[PDB]
Amino acid sequence: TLRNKFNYNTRECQTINPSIRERGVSTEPPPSDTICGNITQWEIFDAYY
């Protein structure tokens, strides 16, 4: 009889929680290509000429 509706209100309260989510990310660097160049005095000059 002492515990009333206007002597003990009863509130509900929660916090806003973001939904958990599981994702994959694979980072692969730019491809690396072998190059073979030869330089001789003539091949320089041939272009130069």
Partner 1 sequence: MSEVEDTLNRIKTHKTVLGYLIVNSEGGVVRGAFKDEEESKNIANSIPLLTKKARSVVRDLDPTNDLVFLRIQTKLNEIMVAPDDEFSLIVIQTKG
Question: Which stretches of the chain bind partner 1, using CB under 8 A?
Answer: 40-42, 45-46, 49
Give me the count of residues in the chain. Answer: 49
Rounded to a whole number of angstroms, the minimum distance from the CB of residue 38 to partner 1 is: 9
The nearer residue to partner 1, 6 or 45, going by C-beta atoms, is: 45
The DSSP result for 1-49, as a single string, is: --S-SSSS---------PPP--------PPP---------HHHHHHHH-
The nearer residue to partner 1, 16 or 36, going by C-beta atoms, is: 36
Rounded to a whole number of angstroms, the minimum distance from the CB of residue 40 to partner 1 is: 6
